[PDB]
Amino acid sequence: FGGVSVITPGTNTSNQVAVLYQDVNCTTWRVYSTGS
Amino acid sequence: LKSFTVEKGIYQTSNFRVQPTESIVRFPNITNLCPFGEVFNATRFASVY
Amino acid sequence: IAYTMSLGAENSVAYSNNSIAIPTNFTISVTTEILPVSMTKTSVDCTM
Amino acid sequence: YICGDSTECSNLLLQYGSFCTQLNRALTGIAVEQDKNTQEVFAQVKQIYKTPPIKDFGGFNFSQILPDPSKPSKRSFIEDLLFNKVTLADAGFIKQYGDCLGDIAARDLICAQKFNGLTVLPPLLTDEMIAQYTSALLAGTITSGWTFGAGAALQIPFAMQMAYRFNGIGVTQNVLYENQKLIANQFNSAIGK
Amino acid sequence: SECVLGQSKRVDFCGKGYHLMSFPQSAPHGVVFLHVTYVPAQEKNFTT
Amino acid sequence: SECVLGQSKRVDFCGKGYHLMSFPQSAPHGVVFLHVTYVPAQEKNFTTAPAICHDGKAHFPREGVFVSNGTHWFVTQRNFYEPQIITTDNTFVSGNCDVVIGIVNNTVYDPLQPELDS
Numbered sequence A: 001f002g003g004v005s006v007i008t009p010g011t012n013t014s015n016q017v018a019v020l021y022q023d024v025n026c027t028t029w030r031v032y033s034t035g036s
Numbered sequence B: 001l002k003s004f005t006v007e008k009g010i011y012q013t014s015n016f017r018v019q020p021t022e023s024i025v026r027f028p029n030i031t032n033l034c035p036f037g038e039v040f041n042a043t044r045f046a047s048v049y
Numbered sequence C: 001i002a003y004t005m006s007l008g009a010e011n012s013v014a015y016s017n018n019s020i021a022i023p024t025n026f027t028i029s030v031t032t033e034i035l036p037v038s039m040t041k042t043s044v045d046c047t048m
Numbered sequence D: 001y002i003c004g005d006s007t008e009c010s011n012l013l014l015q016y017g018s019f020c021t022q023l024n025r026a027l028t029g030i031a032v033e034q035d036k037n038t039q040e041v042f043a044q045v046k047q048i049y050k051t052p053p054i055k056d057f058g059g060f061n062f063s064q065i066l067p068d069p070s071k072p073s074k075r076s077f078i079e080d081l082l083f084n085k086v087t088l089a090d091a092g093f094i095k096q097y098g099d100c101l102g103d104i105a106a107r108d109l110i111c112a113q114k115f116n117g118l119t120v121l122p123p124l125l126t127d128e129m130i131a132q133y134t135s136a137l138l139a140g141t142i143t144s145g146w147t148f149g150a151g152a153a154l155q156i157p158f159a160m161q162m163a164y165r166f167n168g169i170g171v172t173q174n175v176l177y178e179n180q181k182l183i184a185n186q187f188n189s190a191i192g193k
Numbered sequence E: 001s002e003c004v005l006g007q008s009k010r011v012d013f014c015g016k017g018y019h020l021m022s023f024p025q026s027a028p029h030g031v032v033f034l035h036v037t038y039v040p041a042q043e044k045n046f047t048t
Numbered sequence F: 001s002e003c004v005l006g007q008s009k010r011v012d013f014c015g016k017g018y019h020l021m022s023f024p025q026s027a028p029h030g031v032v033f034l035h036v037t038y039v040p041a042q043e044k045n046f047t048t049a050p051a052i053c054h055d056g057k058a059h060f061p062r063e064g065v066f067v068s069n070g071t072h073w074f075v076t077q078r079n080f081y082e083p084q085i086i087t088t089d090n091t092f093v094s095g096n097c098d099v100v101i102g103i104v105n106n107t108v109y110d111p112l113q114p115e116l117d118s
């Protein structure tokens, strides 16, 4: 259950990405990695 | 068009499809006949286990 | 970074009984507008 | 959607990834097009003109459609009525796994839709932003007339703007200045109706 | 573009009658235009 | 059809501002329009009035609007600042001057009385 989206710049710039998990609070949970 | 009459214009037909000329076969050249008598005509067979 | 998008620059306008703003100078502007008109025409052979 | 929560059928289905990718691409294009449509329709003006500071337009009453700074939104009365008439069906944007699992003895539509891989994305622009855009358009068209759509906005009295508009349709402006009270009363009655 | 940011001379485009002005309002997945127009009411017979 | 072969009065149809002219150019599978338009730049503040009363009768401008330098009164066009002296062939009279809201007191020059005087 729950959709997942990935926000990323061009791969020729950086490899860091952000992950948006739909239909869930963060205020562990159903996430791949909590991180910070 | 499934009809004997064709109106004035330009129509598209099948591409230029060319028929083959001859047929060839290329198999590796092996002369031996592997044993049909050591598999089917043997004197002793093994158990099923 | 993640933020909230802006709705453009913010300002206001003065209004009264009898205050009118009238132009004195002008400018001639040139703008580009692009419009597609057609695509590629294609044909398909069913059997092939 | 096809055979979720199954392993063998996924291995069988691996030969339709092109079809699935093409469907997803079409849907993504649809969503991007809808966002672009909203942005193009509602963002014609770029500068957020504030609401008029004083109200002496000449008898015309615009409190019916101008925003009221009394609720957490900038929606006027007409906008509130229009929102109250039509009812949505997506039921917000958040539905956690602990809620769809809660109502297992009662049937739900969104939970069944989401359990089969059918999701609804949220719009890029919220209703507050659209209300702000509409309020800016109202302020521009009331305080400055039609001049704010062609370059900078120029101040002009509302009675003079009405005289300009009457002269536009072939009626001399002395008609307005001799009947301003009646025209204002008629406009107020029409907006009330 | 044509009825809120200006005045329209096209007949029957924004409301019946002679177009004077217009107001936009939002709605869920839509827009609502309030068109303010001018309509002659009391006709009188004359020779010309 | 509407912007190259003529002039368009539709707002925001062919470029921002007031449409003057347009030029077409080709492109692979498309067209490109160069719209030449007119944009006012330098605004100036003025005080104004809808009409004036001279001899008990109101005078409304034919084309333009009344403005003031602060002590004098002029009539000027609506998209440019070209002040002119108030006179009878720029204004027309419509009834008495006790019905209009916002009227002001000013004199009107007649271009025929000084001519007959001499």
Ligand SMILES: *[C@@H]1O[C@H](CO)[C@@H](O[C@@H]2O[C@H](CO)[C@@H](O)[C@H](O)[C@H]2NC(C)=O)[C@H](O)[C@H]1NC(C)=O
Pocket (backbone or CB within 6 Å): C025, C026
């Ligand atoms: C109206 O604006 C234009 C440009 O904004 C002014 O033209 C400039 O005039 C000065 C001196 O004559 C030149 O040095 C500039 O090169 C001109 N600019 C351009 C783009 O040509 C013009 O002076 C202004 N007119 C008035 C009455 O203020």
Ligand SMILES: *[C@@H]1O[C@H](CO)[C@@H](O[C@@H]2O[C@H](CO)[C@@H](O)[C@H](O)[C@H]2NC(C)=O)[C@H](O)[C@H]1NC(C)=O
Pocket (backbone or CB within 6 Å): F053, F104, F105
């Ligand atoms: C414009 O001119 C007329 C005439 O001089 C002024 O009308 C007079 O106003 C005073 C006080 O309101 C009255 O006592 C007079 O009887 C009026 N005279 C006439 C002929 O009506 C008028 O006040 C002037 N406008 C302004 C703003 O002062």
Ligand SMILES: *[C@@H]1O[C@H](CO)[C@@H](O)[C@H](O)[C@H]1NC(C)=O
Pocket (backbone or CB within 6 Å): B036, B037, B041
């Ligand atoms: C199998 O063995 C028998 C005698 O050993 C012989 O007669 C027969 O020809 C053989 N068959 C084949 C296919 O070799």
Ligand SMILES: *[C@@H]1O[C@H](CO)[C@@H](O)[C@H](O)[C@H]1NC(C)=O
Pocket (backbone or CB within 6 Å): E043, E044, E045, E046
């Ligand atoms: C003008 O002429 C016709 C025929 O006499 C008449 O019916 C009509 O009422 C007249 N118009 C008005 C406004 O009275």
Ligand SMILES: *[C@@H]1O[C@H](CO)[C@@H](O)[C@H](O)[C@H]1NC(C)=O
Pocket (backbone or CB within 6 Å): C014, C019, C021, F043, F044, F045, F046
């Ligand atoms: C006209 O009035 C306002 C308020 O005084 C002022 O801010 C504005 O600058 C004036 N317009 C111009 C072009 O100066």
Ligand SMILES: *[C@@H]1O[C@H](CO)[C@@H](O)[C@H](O)[C@H]1NC(C)=O
Pocket (backbone or CB within 6 Å): F069, F070, F071, F072
């Ligand atoms: C305003 O314009 C008139 C006409 O030229 C002039 O006589 C007058 O001195 C000007 N007043 C000011 C304050 O500029």
Ligand SMILES: *[C@@H]1O[C@H](CO)[C@@H](O)[C@H](O)[C@H]1NC(C)=O
Pocket (backbone or CB within 6 Å): C016, C017, D055, D056, F101, F102
């Ligand atoms: C102009 O507006 C102000 C504030 O409402 C007011 O003092 C004044 O009476 C008004 N004058 C006219 C002609 O409307």
